């Protein structure tokens, strides 16, 4: 089976039969 | 089998049986 | 098999059994 | 086999059993 | 085999078993 490497993330969801909105803002100084 | 490398992401969704929405805003100075 | 490297992204969807939409806004200086 | 390197992107869709759309907006000053 | 390097793009679609559309809007100064 294939492997998925995840390093930085807000969270990991597997088997989501529902829904969840996600927002991310990236800004630099 | 293929390998997937994810470094930076808002989140990782595997096995999405529903709709999923994501918003991302990038701003630079 | 081919390898896919993802560095920066809003999110990664693997095994999408439904529709998925993403919005990305980039503000340049 | 070919290799695909993705640095910056709105998102990456692998294994789309449905349809996926993305909106990208670039603003300039 | 050819190599594909994507630095910046609207999105990346791999394994399109249906259709994919994207909207790109660029605001000019």
From Swiss-Prot, chains A, B, C, D, E:
Domain of life: Eukaryota
Segments carrying motif RIP homotypic interaction motif (RHIM): 4-20
Cellular location(s): Cytoplasm, Cytosol; Nucleus
Distribution of this protein across tissues and organs: Highly expressed in the pancreas. Detected at lower levels in heart, placenta, lung and kidney.
Modifications the protein undergoes after translation, according to the UniProt entry: (Microbial infection) Proteolytically cleaved by S.flexneri OspD3 within the RIP homotypic interaction motif (RHIM), leading to its degradation and inhibition of necroptosis.
Disulphide bond pairs: none
Family: Belongs to the protein kinase superfamily. TKL Ser/Thr protein kinase family.
Free-text note on domains in this protein's UniProt record: The RIP homotypic interaction motif/RHIM mediates interaction with the RHIM motif of RIPK1. Both motifs form a hetero-amyloid serpentine fold, stabilized by hydrophobic packing and featuring an unusual Cys-Ser ladder of alternating Ser (from RIPK1) and Cys (from RIPK3). (Microbial infection) The RIP homotypic interaction motif/RHIM mediates interaction with the RHIM motif of the herpes simplex virus 1/HHV-1 protein RIR1/ICP6 to form heteromeric amyloid structures.
Function: Serine/threonine-protein kinase that activates necroptosis and apoptosis, two parallel forms of cell death. Necroptosis, a programmed cell death process in response to death-inducing TNF-alpha family members, is triggered by RIPK3 following activation by ZBP1. Activated RIPK3 forms a necrosis-inducing complex and mediates phosphorylation of MLKL, promoting MLKL localization to the plasma membrane and execution of programmed necrosis characterized by calcium influx and plasma membrane damage.
Oligomer and partners: Interacts (via RIP homotypic interaction motif) with RIPK1 (via RIP homotypic interaction motif); this interaction induces RIPK1 phosphorylation and formation of a RIPK1-RIPK3 necrosis-inducing complex. Interacts with MLKL; the interaction is direct and triggers necroptosis. Interacts with ZBP1 (via RIP homotypic interaction motif); interaction with ZBP1 activates RIPK3, triggering necroptosis. Upon TNF-induced necrosis, the RIPK1-RIPK3 dimer further interacts with PGAM5 and MLKL; the formation of this complex leads to PGAM5 phosphorylation and increase in PGAM5 phosphatase activity. (Microbial infection) Interacts (via RIP homotypic interaction motif/RHIM) with herpes simplex virus 1/HHV-1 protein RIR1/ICP6 (via RHIM); this interaction may induce heteromeric amyloid assemblies and prevent necroptosis activation.
Name this polypeptide is given: Receptor-interacting serine/threonine-protein kinase 3
Gene coding for it: RIPK3
Whole sequence portion shown: 447 to 475 of 518
